[PDB]
Amino acid sequence: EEEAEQNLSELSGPWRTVYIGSTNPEKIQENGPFRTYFRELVFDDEKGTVDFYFSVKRDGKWKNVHVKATKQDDGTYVADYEGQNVFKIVSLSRTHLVAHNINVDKHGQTTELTELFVKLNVEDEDLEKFWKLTEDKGIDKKNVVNFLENENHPH
Amino acid sequence: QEEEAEQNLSELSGPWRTVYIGSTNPEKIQENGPFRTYFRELVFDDEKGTVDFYFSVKRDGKWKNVHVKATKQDDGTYVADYEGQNVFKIVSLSRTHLVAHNINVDKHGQTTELTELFVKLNVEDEDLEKFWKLTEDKGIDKKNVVNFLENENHPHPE
Ligand SMILES: Nc1cccc2cc3ccccc3cc12
Ligand SMILES: Nc1cccc2cc3ccccc3cc12
């Protein structure tokens, strides 16, 4: 029985959107800028940043977007995306993230959003079991597809 | 022989995702292949001894949502019809992962063995409650909350 040492950087990896609520429904409706499907998050303790990778449909077309947020002394984060954003992590653990975001768009309109995100955790022992079974069946490693990275890098 | 196994898999039902799929015949999982399956949901029924698979596959340049029902055998394996006949076994299973072995025989008698690793997206009640309270605190109407786990309009992996 063992578990990796808890580190903020250990939280980095594939994350998925569960729910997003908005004070302004138009922001999360079809073609809304905040109807975001998360792919990956990267936390950097040293730099005090969080890199967001997500997908959003715009003009009937899916787009991959990257946003870097920077931490402030008070602990909140600021990011530039469809206006200015100040977001706050309300709850965070190895498997979930609950956040509150305040957005002020290019017209001075303020929208507040809430979101619940979950992390996809792949444990070492499970990967080992998969590879052993795969080698037992005489399957060459080049004949294995990584579906998770495909989902993390869509088009 | 061996003795019966107490089967309580019902609680493992929910959203699941494909991590890796291996195959003895690469054609079956290459792009446009029948087993290049992106899982979405699994539902286990301990009373009927079945498992419902819900996944997406791209065929001839078009995305398809597929539903397959598998039935458990006395042997402990499950059988299901999909692009031929399939007999699969759960080699390792927990609240977070599933490692399985599947044997498929297509319409031409060709045998293909596949291995797979799937992961569950677990949403805890404690975290859901935190989200709902926060959402209520900010005066957001339940109608103004979008569910991204079970949504029709989603990005394409390829
Ligand atoms: N700061 C941000 C930048 C880009 C997208 C965001 C999407 C969010 C969704 C729910 C809650 C907070 C969010 C913050 C975001
Ligand atoms: N029963 C099934 C139906 C449809 C696709 C499957 C893809 C699989 C991939 C690896 C291991 C087992 C699998 C079973 C499958």
Side-chain angles (χ1 to χ4, degrees), chain A residues 1-114 116-155, chain B residues 1-115 117-158:
Chain A
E1 181 181 63
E2 68 296 303
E3 57 80 60
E5 189 188 69
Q6 301 180 299
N7 314 306
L8 184 67
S9 297
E10 184 75 7
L11 268 44
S12 302
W15 282 79
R16 297 290 182 268
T17 307
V18 177
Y19 291 120
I20 292 181
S22 182
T23 52
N24 185 332
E26 78 184 1
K27 298 295 181 171
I28 56 177
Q29 284 172 32
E30 179 175 301
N31 283 299
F34 285 87
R35 192 182 179 93
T36 63
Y37 280 82
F38 279 24
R39 296 145 49 194
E40 295 180 64
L41 298 181
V42 182
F43 299 80
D44 188 322
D45 334 32
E46 290 176 52
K47 295 188 179 58
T49 61
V50 175
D51 285 277
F52 289 87
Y53 293 88
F54 54 91
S55 295
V56 63
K57 198 194 242 196
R58 183 243 296 292
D59 293 304
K61 293 175 291 186
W62 286 102
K63 305 296 181 174
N64 289 333
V65 180
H66 159 61
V67 173
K68 186 182 226 63
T70 302
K71 196 171 188 293
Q72 306 195 79
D73 291 0
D74 58 28
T76 60
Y77 290 77
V78 294
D80 176 39
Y81 175 71
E82 298 298 313
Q84 299 182 292
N85 301 278
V86 173
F87 66 96
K88 217 250 219 315
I89 296 188
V90 174
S91 188
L92 180 60
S93 76
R94 181 174 181 290
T95 59
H96 79 97
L97 159 50
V98 178
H100 169 220
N101 183 241
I102 297 170
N103 169 261
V104 177
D105 68 31
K106 54 246 63 183
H107 298 306
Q109 175 174 55
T110 184
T111 302
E112 298 202 22
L113 302 97
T114 56
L116 166 63
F117 310 86
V118 61
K119 182 181 177 182
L120 271 61
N121 282 301
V122 177
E123 237 58 63
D124 293 355
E125 67 179 357
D126 303 319
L127 283 172
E128 184 52 62
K129 290 166 189 165
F130 169 74
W131 286 112
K132 174 59 162 66
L133 173 67
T134 299
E135 53 198 9
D136 283 346
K137 303 307 173 183
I139 293 172
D140 192 298
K141 298 182 181 300
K142 63 180 181 62
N143 287 166
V144 180
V145 175
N146 189 145
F147 293 68
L148 182 56
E149 296 304 339
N150 286 349
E151 287 189 1
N152 282 181
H153 306 84
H155 64 54
Chain B
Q1 60 176 298
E2 60 196 74
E3 307 279 335
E4 196 68 3
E6 198 75 1
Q7 183 182 178
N8 286 177
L9 284 58
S10 177
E11 296 311 299
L12 299 174
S13 301
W16 286 75
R17 297 291 181 271
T18 307
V19 180
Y20 284 112
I21 292 181
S23 180
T24 52
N25 186 326
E27 186 63 31
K28 299 295 179 173
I29 59 175
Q30 290 168 350
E31 301 188 7
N32 193 188
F35 286 87
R36 176 169 277 252
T37 61
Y38 291 84
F39 276 34
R40 293 203 313 292
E41 190 100 358
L42 296 176
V43 179
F44 296 87
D45 185 335
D46 298 307
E47 297 146 299
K48 303 305 177 182
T50 62
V51 182
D52 290 280
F53 290 83
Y54 292 92
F55 56 92
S56 304
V57 189
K58 194 181 183 180
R59 301 298 198 68
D60 303 342
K62 306 295 285 300
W63 283 94
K64 265 62 177 180
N65 292 313
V66 183
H67 169 49
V68 175
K69 177 185 293 292
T71 309
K72 182 188 173 184
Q73 310 190 73
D74 302 354
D75 183 4
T77 59
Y78 295 74
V79 302
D81 287 301
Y82 175 69
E83 289 299 318
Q85 295 178 179
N86 308 87
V87 172
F88 79 80
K89 324 76 187 305
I90 293 174
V91 184
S92 186
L93 184 65
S94 76
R95 283 286 172 292
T96 63
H97 79 95
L98 161 65
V99 177
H101 173 209
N102 181 243
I103 299 173
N104 171 265
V105 176
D106 62 20
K107 56 180 181 182
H108 299 307
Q110 313 187 80
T111 302
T112 301
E113 300 203 38
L114 303 102
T115 54
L117 171 61
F118 307 87
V119 68
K120 185 179 180 179
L121 282 63
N122 288 298
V123 180
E124 289 187 54
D125 277 10
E126 265 190 353
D127 301 316
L128 275 175
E129 283 168 50
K130 196 65 172 176
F131 167 83
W132 283 117
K133 176 187 179 299
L134 175 65
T135 296
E136 180 170 3
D137 287 345
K138 307 286 85 171
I140 295 169
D141 183 7
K142 273 187 174 296
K143 179 190 63 53
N144 296 315
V145 176
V146 175
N147 184 318
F148 291 72
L149 230 47
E150 304 74 40
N151 207 86
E152 59 167 58
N153 190 190
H154 60 67
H156 299 299
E158 50 176 290

